[PDB]
Design a protein around this ligand. Structure first.
Ligand SMILES: OC[C@H]1O[C@H](O[C@H]2[C@H](O)[C@@H](O)[C@@H](O)O[C@@H]2CO)[C@H](O)[C@@H](O)[C@@H]1O
Length: 401
């Protein structure tokens, strides 16, 4: 199903995929082995669908939060870096791609959202979310807006929902409690309410997506946006005079973005596991490898110590790491995809006025908790009854669409 003797790589469309394809060319030049980089739509859903039938790319790139799930489903090969190779990347990046004791991906870079602002429209960007309504009125009088960011992906609204107490799964004593979901508590509700009120009072539009936000910021129509490192080179080319800074506070609490570690996994179905490791260890995770990708779209703070040090003085990366330190590294547990699906629905339904904030988050809490538990009890049934028809029939009924 997967062709032997070449490498197929999937990476998200906002990432430096042409830069990655140049690393693939260097590899073709040395080894004679061809490398095709693709950025399919809805990658993180596509990968488990094809990989489950034994198909898909040799290498999958995504933030580490989806990897525990892919690993629980048997879609990923355990990786085999030697100790010398492991020494080249920071310890906390290895930790993010460790699942049940096993390394399940190669860490590439640490990403967090920051506030991005146009210095010509707004020399002094707001410290607090609460100042945005008055700032938007001032800017509307000049034919501009205060803030636009992607409202269709809950990743972008999460920092605000988390500011006053929203959380995915409660983390204590080194473990996530999968029954303790923080999606409908008073702090989550307050943050989503603030966002919905911005929409109701006409300071933002519920339909705003990634491309709408990026164009408007890059063409100077809005004074602020919320985005990651991968967005910066488009802003460089647009010549807007921008700064990257700390997210505004909400109720005097820091915004708490969920932090991702962009990682590369090897497909368990892949007949090229050795070729894949040669590429990632010896071509991509080198100074020259990461530079080709970073020069395409910035990676953030990369996992490779040698090249991290080279980019450490960039104020935009310092701001990134200042926001990351206020937030938290996402869990990689298999229950994360349940969390994200439930919160996506809540934000879109609350924003568009289809449900109240209270109803939207009540149902997201219920759905997230129920789906997490279905993941949990599935693994338990397999431990009890093995890989068997009995356990297959229990699981089909338990996870019934
Ligand atoms: O919106 C939920 C979504 O958040 C994160 O996805 C990010 C990704 O980590 C970033 O690299 C960037 O590309 O934007 C994505 C959001 O559009 C989680 O990694 C992802 O699993 C989750 O569904």
């Amino acid at each position: 199903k997967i062709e032997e003797g070449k490498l197929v790589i999937w990476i998200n469309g906002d990432k430096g995929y042409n830069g990655l394809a140049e690393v693939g060319k260097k590899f073709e030049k040395d080894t004679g082995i061809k490398v095709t980089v693709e950025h399919p739509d809805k990658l993180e859903e596509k990968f488990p669908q094809v990989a489950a039938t034994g198909d898909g790319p040799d290498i999958i790139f995504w933030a580490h939060d989806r990897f525990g799930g892919y690993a629980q489903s048997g879609l990923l090969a355990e990786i085999t870096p030697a100790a010398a190779f492991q020494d080249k990347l920071y310890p906390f990046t290895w930790d993010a791609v460790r699942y049940n004791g096993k390394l399940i991906a190669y860490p590439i870079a640490v990403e967090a959202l920051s506030l991005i602002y146009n210095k010509d429209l707004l020399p002094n960007p707001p410290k607090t979310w609460e100042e945005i309504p008055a700032l938007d009125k001032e800017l509307k009088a000049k034919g501009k807006s205060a803030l636009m960011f992607n409202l269709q992906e809950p990743y972008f609204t999460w920092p605000l929902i988390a500011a006053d107490g929203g959380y995915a799964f409660k983390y204590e004593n080194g473990k996530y409690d999968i029954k303790d979901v923080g999606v409908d508590n008073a702090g989550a509700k307050a943050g989503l309410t603030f966002l919905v009120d911005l929409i109701k009072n006409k300071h933002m539009n519920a339909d705003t997506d990634y491309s709408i936000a990026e164009a408007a910021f890059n063409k100077g129509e809005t004074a602020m946006t919320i985005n990651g490192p991968w967005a910066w080179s488009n802003i460089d080319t647009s010549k807007v005079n921008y700064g990257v800074t700390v997210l505004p506070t909400f109720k005097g609490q820091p915004s708490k973005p969920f932090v991702g570690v962009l990682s590369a996994g090897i497909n368990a179905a892949s007949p090229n596991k050795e070729l894949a490791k040669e590429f990632l260890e010896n071509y991509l995770l080198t100074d020259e490898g990461l530079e080709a990708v970073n020069k395409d779209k910035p990676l953030g703070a990369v996992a490779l110590k040698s090249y991290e040090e080279e980019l450490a003085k960039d104020p935009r990366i310092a701001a990134t790491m200042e926001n990351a330190q206020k937030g938290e590294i996402m869990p990689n547990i298999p229950q994360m995809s349940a969390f994200w699906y439930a919160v996506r629905t809540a934000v879109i339904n609350a924003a568009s006025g289809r449900q109240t904030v209270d109803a939207a988050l009540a149902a997201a809490q219920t759905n997230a908790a129920a789906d997490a538990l279905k993941i949990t009890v599935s693994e338990m049934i397999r431990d009890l009854f093995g890989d068997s028809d009995k356990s297959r029939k229990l699981l089909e009924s338990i996870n019934m669409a």
